[PDB]
């Protein structure tokens, strides 16, 4: 019953972002707030601070700068997402609860089309969440845990005969020494813990946005079905009161969908702005790294796996914002297609107000700067290309 | 063949089929089997020559000028192959689009205008087809003439390159009589077929748009007398007649909207691909134009490439802009009638029609842009600014 | 010269005819024969002079600076030739536009406001005509003075170039003899005639726009008391009066829309050609300004060229933007009346008027752009950015 | 200082007067004479010091880096001079704006919300004033510290330059003697007064915008129960009550529209001039940032200049965007109520309000641009692009 964002609920719980995720009325509690703040500060100490210190201390060329900037960009963006979503937990939980309420309302319907919509949406949600989380967890594991795998392989194959001096993951500078085995082990353990938290944050929040957009689209399709039922009722030739009531219910459903979109925009405005700002640089830096070390190397493998991840991360938000916009827009077409000419002029004026509202553009803005649509994917992408070319000019 | 939108566009369908554009749907089953092989063969030959060109691009990869020229040719000849492969995979939506107007609405009062505008649309479609066919034939003839007048020489010292219409590496000698004539004939056939395929698909798209625009014109023209029919405190007969007229208008408008949506799906994906190729083509062409210094052959070739690319873009854009302006004009024509003398029902119908027409119909390249003269203006401005910056950098 | 919109513009038409803008339509038939000849002669002379300018460019093309200056002058003096040839070929649409307002509407209650705003429009038209004529006279005087204060010297070694207002090659010795004075008078006549013809056509366009804007102002002013007339239930006479007022308002709005469309059809291609020439002129002028060092003669000439070009563009844009603003503000004028106290018919009329005003009337350059202060801002930004790039590159 | 919108802004008016922004309108006549003199004196000193900077820029133009730095400083300190001169010439429109809300609307049912939102607006205005004042003080302190931590040295060989906050040529020896301390105090006064005048005018503009936004919020809040009042057939008293409520809503919206129009009239040219100066400042600042290598004092100064300029632009754009968003959201507020259960009159009221709210109120810089976060993004992207071009071309 509560399968609404079931996999996303599991991912959130694994983060300790929400304790009792599997409830039908997820409750905001201060204990989760403070535990998640502590878990938010863990990556900053383990990942952000050492890597930034290395960037602003030990960087000695442009190639080293780009190499250090490839992972730290995404790490910093993920920490920002940690903080933003911890701050907005109330709105996010309210949005999830309202989506659950709408899903429960829909599941009571007896129309086969609605039931097919419900099943299709559930399957889409599950598949998308699983694929996204698996891909990004694999990316993070490849980037962070490679030395451990190499050490295990060397110990298994060469035993203690050959020597393979293990080194830490992506370069960083630590205030304390790590030469000692105990300090090295503790630092690596906390690095892995921070990496796990960051991977879960990225996967869970991106999947939450995509899945909420999917459910909003499903609710819009339910509204379309209701409008078609109103049109059939108009053709059947019923009384004025019945059509008035049907139009009122359709208007209420439209208002509910608009409220859901408003809550999503409020929750994810700054999220999207930071995401686009970071991706603009991330795609460029990853592409430059890929062209710098292309060959039969582990770096080539890591960069080739990373680049599609970032590109699809940007395309996710662009595509689903476009879906929100277009689905909201099509309501005017759905209301124009019914035989409104058969209705009394009063109901026609009500339909006219409905259509006046339904035509206003709707969607999620990039922190009020602009509305996010599919075309944005080009814009940001083009920007990335610019930076990329710049780097080449600097080299030669 | 005996239904609307395929009886009107039948000559274009036949032209498409003749050049080897699949379309195994609008003839007797007897020709269904033979024609298929022909189509396949054509594609084969096309691909063959295409591959035969690509291989050459490898040998001439050392230099940069010939690399740019070969890349421009490769994109130019990529267009038709992309269109040819694109049609069969999306054939179902194309056939759905061509069957949209089999059963249109009809009203006794608006039959004359409907027939007049249908005939006008057919005439304009025929004119567009003939004009594009003439342009393609002229392009082929000018290409061949340019190849024959211009000197075939390679700068390394002067090494005489084969005097063939398209640069290509051939296992044949390509210099003796037999190989030279075979290559000339094959390249002539290849050019004709590629140009015809690309331009015929584009003309089909533009003919759909022309039909939509003419239907919108008919809607406005018959909207003008609709209100005067309403304007006159009406007897039940007049109320029913006005309701029937309003129903006819609204249903026809919705039919036009459906046609526009189907065309938008199909050739919106097609247009995304087309403009994705055209952007790189225009960038390389601007770089090439940077090197023009009045030489007849080089300047003529660069001008021809630019003219062809910009002409394809401009055709798409002009017809899209016509559709947009026709929808906005539907709004304006709704306003400019005697609605103040009509009844509340007619006034509400006008209000809702204008509100719907606030947003004009358009065709988008898969939601990444909209085809209009604004898109052509953006393309021209980008290429011109890039050329200015490039020439200054030199 | 008796009907509206031609009696109002009669000074402009007379100026146009005087300088040679054909226009064999608005005087006694007796003058049709002689005047025509004069016009032809002027055109000949213009082209005649233009010819020797082009020839001067051919042998002055060895260097880049002189070639750039000659090209800038050639485009500057191409403008008027294009306008002069453009008017007679499209004279039919021009005469249709000038006869659009021969039969306007009339309502007893709104007659006084109509007369007041018509008088205001006439005064504004005359003011614009006088201002543009003064600007042209000032430009001619400045050109004649600057050609004399500066030193006529050519750098090769120092060669005495003829002291002429416009660079030009003459078969005769136009240095010190009677050829010099003859060339001076001929070039003065050429300058005056070309500038006057160009500016007169531009002022005719802008005066059409002024008339439309004043009519919109009248529409809003009378919208204010129309609702009060409706609000006051209403007897049959009062309902009829409200209906008549609404009919008058709607029909006058439609008439203004017709006038705007006619003006756009008449002048779209002219605007497109003007901006096409400008773009290149401004590019070459940015290159010229890149070489300015001091407050010497060269800086003055470059600044004058830039000022004249940007002034033409700015005039077109200001009047286009004024039309846009008036058309938009019709909606605010419709909202600001006491429509809540009116009847149902008046409220529906207000609703439909706002619906229609949701989009502003504008003049487009053959559907490629629109004339507004945004267009002028874009042009200025483009030229400034090109100047900055040119400075950086060198 | 007794009526609305002037008692609300009274701290701002007093700050403006204290810094010398004229404003001889809102105190006792007895103070009219002395205060005026003080203002004049301030201006004199400003110009005096300004002149001494320009003189310093004349003999510092031998080099390019120093010329660029001097130009940036001169534009930065031209901002306040332009604003200070701009206010008195346009004092009429400013005083008309400040007296717009002297006679506002009132309805018993919406009085409490009106008072609450008025108080909220006052608090927000005070918060904005204090924030801007604190930012100005921090800027002054940072300048006065950076002048001292850095080393006063000139590269020619090392020439010990006087240690002053602002580069300037002084007839007296302003290095070690009493001239040094006098120059330091004078420069501190100049900095404080210039920043204060500029930021105070900007804060007045933003406070007008804040008042408009809060009034729009009040309008939406009372829109919510207006329909509840309408929905309930209706007796004559109830119909009259709904009519009065609709009249109140529409008239208050029109008053907000008038206030926005007056603010635009007052400050459009000021915004245009501010952005004109900014553009050049940001160009020179991009060139300066091109030379940043390290975390030394030069980087701090460049970062401070960029931060201050972009902060002014960002403040203007923030409040413009807020106005746009509130005006747009009026329709979302109007739709979310139970507009379908109301009477016919209330439904037409909602319809017309939505039609009006299709467009958002905005402030434009003399019709050349609009203040919005989009404008800030465009300016930031332009400066970033210019920096990229500078680094690439070199
Ligand atoms: C390369 C990357 N490492 C982590 C921990 C990310 C979230 S991305």
Residue numbers in the entry:
A (entry chain D): 2 to 397
B (entry chain C), C (entry chain B), D (entry chain A): 4 to 159, 168 to 243, 313 to 474
Recite the paper's sentences.
As a basis for understanding how odorants activate these heteromeric receptors, we report here cryo-EM structures of two different heteromeric odorant receptor complexes containing ORs from disease-vector mosquitos Aedes aegypti or Anopheles gambiae. We determined the structure of a heteromeric complex formed by ORs from these species in complex with a Apocrypta bakeri fig wasp Orco that is amenable to structural determination.
To determine if the 1:3 subunit stoichiometry can be observed with other members of the OR family, we turned to studying the OR28 receptor of An. gambiae, a main vector of malaria, that responds to the natural odorants acetophenone (a plant volatile) and 2,4,5-trimethylthiazole (henceforth TMT; an animal odor, originally isolated from anal secretions of mammals). A different heteromeric OR/Orco complex also has a 1:3 subunit stoichiometry and a similar mode of channel activation. Overall, subunit stoichiometry, mechanism of pore opening and ligand binding of the AgOR28/Orco complex largely resembles the observations of the AaOR10/Orco complex, suggesting that these might be conserved features of this family of proteins.
